[PDB]
């Protein structure tokens, strides 16, 4: 049996920064700032979670599926940005 944190009033926690994909707590970037994979929607994805999505993934946020961007520890991939095309018709979302 447990509750969460010691003492009465809870301590800074369960904010959300904690990645959702795997769970691990989204640490800090190579510089120090908070590592926020996706900001547009706000999908909590650690470092080893964002890169992949672009490495082997599809390069589209699994929450909003928006255009990505070369991060600190994320080398460019084949599908970062494309040019306007005659492909219209939003099948899903
Ligand atoms: Zn993760
Ligand atoms: Zn997103």
Alpha-carbon separation of residue 47 from 1, 18, 59 (angstroms): 33, 11, 14
For the chain, give the number of residues: 93
Q: Is 76 annotated as a binding residue?
A: no
Structure-token pair, residue 43 = 């999908």
Distance of CA 41 to the CA centre of its chain: 9
Yes or no: say if 84 and 60 are a contact pair by the CB < 8 Å rule: no
Q: Is 33 annotated as a binding residue?
A: no
Q: How far apart are CA 81 and CA 67, in angstroms?
A: 7
What are the two backbone dihedrals, phi and then psi, of residue 18, each rounded to the nearest 5 degrees? Answer: -60, 120
Q: Among candidates 27, 81, 31, 35, which has minimal Cα distance to 54?
A: 81
Which DSSP string do the residues of the chain spell out, in sequence order?
---SSSSSSPPS--SS-B-SSS--B--B-SSSSB--S-SSS-----HHHHHHHHHTS-SB-TTT--B----TT----TTS-----S----S--
Q: Which ligand places an atom closest to the C-alpha of 18?
A: 1
Q: Which ligand places an atom closest to the C-alpha of 48?
A: 1
Span from the CA of 58 to the centroid of ligand 1 (angstroms): 16
Span from the CA of 18 to the centroid of ligand 1 (angstroms): 8
Q: Is 58 annotated as a binding residue?
A: no
Structural domains of the chain, ranges and CATH numbers in brackets: 1-93 (3.30.40.10)
């Amino acid at each position: 049996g447990s509750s969460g944190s010691s003492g009465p009033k809870p301590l800074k926690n369960l904010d959300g920064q904690f990645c959702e994909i795997c769970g691990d707590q989204i640490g800090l970037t190579v510089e120090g700032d908070l590592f926020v994979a996706c900001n547009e929607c706000g999908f909590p994805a650690c470092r080893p979670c964002y890169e992949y999505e672009r490495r082997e993934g599809t390069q589209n946020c699994p929450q909003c599926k928006t255009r990505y961007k070369r991060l600190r520890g994320s080398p460019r991939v084949e599908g970062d940005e494309d040019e306007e095309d005659i492909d219209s018709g939003p099948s899903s979302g």
